[PDB]
Amino acid sequence: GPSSQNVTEYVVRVPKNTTKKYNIMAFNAADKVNFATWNQARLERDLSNKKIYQEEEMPESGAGSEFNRKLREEARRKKYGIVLKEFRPEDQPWLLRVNGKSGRKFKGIKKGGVTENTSYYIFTQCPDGAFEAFPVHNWYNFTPLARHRTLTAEEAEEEWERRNKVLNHFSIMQQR
């Protein structure tokens, strides 16, 4: 039939600007990602700066230095280090939470290696029958986090002190 010798040729279109930027979402094959159960999802910038960058300067900042003491306090903190960095969301990883808290959580990180000598484009079918190419603004590799009980850091330190766990570890996990 015609399938054994079909020749398909389509026009290529590259619009100058698109309202929505195009990115790449890559999942590892072993993760067995399935979209049938993806009833809902939440993709947002991370807040890990809570732990290591911001609102960590909450209490000492609003303690209440004033007057000459205020001037000295601000100048002293600034000159002590090199002005702590705050939230600049566009340069931070992405957090994905599928089906709320019940479903799996993935973390996407921008591909550090830039494509100074390469570009990536995506071809999508359209009713007009011409391929459309959109540049890849960013590449993200998402990796899942198990929805299992997580050891507390303090408890983890206590357990690690007993590095020689002669007793079965599985029972220890059950106890936690």
């Binding site: 732990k51 290591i52 550090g112 990796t143 020689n164």
Partner: protein, 196 residues
């Protein structure tokens, strides 16, 4: 002045050291700046005997720069963000079909089975770090900085290069495991290929 080559992985065997095989890599930031920082991946000898120690046998440890105490390797991989055991082994062992290498990796996985959180691993690295750590938040950020810059600089120093560092660390471990199995010969310090 002759020096040992930088940005390369060399595996040696030291009899006196408790580690049966030690693999060292001295990394420089493309010779542009900073002193050369050496990161050692070592395998403890099976000579040490205990009910748990003999069962685990050889256990891999890593001497990260500016961390006083030896850190189990699985913990380092989790600190880079690869939490899952399968993914860590994917980086360390390139072909899962071979049983012997997986057997070598199993004890180190068991040693680090307590820590399953990236943040917890970072905190542990900071806590055992030589520089003092006041709080958990400070320790985590400090250890993250150490991993980002001090360890394996030539692979990357910024720009979210954790995957590259993970692959190169896994290569170091892969070479150490191959040396322990005997599939690759231990490197020779006198070879003038190594002596820039």
């Amino acid at each position: 002045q002759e020096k040992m080559a930088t940005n390369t992985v060399y595996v040696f065997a030291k009899k006196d050291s408790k580690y049966a095989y030690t693999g060292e890599c001295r990394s420089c930031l493309e010779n542009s700046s900073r002193p050369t920082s050496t990161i050692w991946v070592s395998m403890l000898a099976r000579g040490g005997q205990g009910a748990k120690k003999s069962a685990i046998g050889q256990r891999i440890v890593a001497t990260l720069p500016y961390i006083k105490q030896e850190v189990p390797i699985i913990i380092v991989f989790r600190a880079l963000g690869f939490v899952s055991d399968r993914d860590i082994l994917e980086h360390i062992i390139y072909d899962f079909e071979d049983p012997e290498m997986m057997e070598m990796v199993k004890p180190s996985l068991d040693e680090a089975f307590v820590i399953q959180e990236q943040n917890v691993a970072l905190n542990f690295i900071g806590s055992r770090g030589a520089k003092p750590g006041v709080t958990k938040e400070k320790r985590i950020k400090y250890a993250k900085e150490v991993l980002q810059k001090e360890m394996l600089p030539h692979v990357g120093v910024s720009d979210f290069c954790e995957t590259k560092k993970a692959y190169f660390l896994g290569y170091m471990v892969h070479r150490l495991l191959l040396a322990a199995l005997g599939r690759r010969e231990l490197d020779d310090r006198d070879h003038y290929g190594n002596k820039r």
